[PDB]
Amino acid sequence: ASVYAWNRKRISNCVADYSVLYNSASFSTFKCYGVSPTKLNDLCFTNVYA
């Protein structure tokens, strides 16, 4: 979308491996904040959003 009304997708009821995402150097950037990328593969959440 136009960034003023950015898309939100709710993510739930699923297993996650974010390293499938951040291992790929295909993006112009992949950065993480508050937590380092590796740690996110250990975590559990009630909801996730993209």
């Binding site: 291992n23 150097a25 992949f30 990328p37």
Partner: protein, 50 residues
Amino acid sequence: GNYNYLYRLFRKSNLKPFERDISTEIYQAGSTPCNGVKGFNCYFPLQSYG
């Protein structure tokens, strides 16, 4: 900014009690082999708060 005082953001392994480390090598956080230079998730680990 004063820049006399320097910080290490990341390391390959955690320090033992009173372990000490002067080494300045580029840290591989992800899929880029650093080989002495920065890249996609390959970072110079040293910082200063300025």
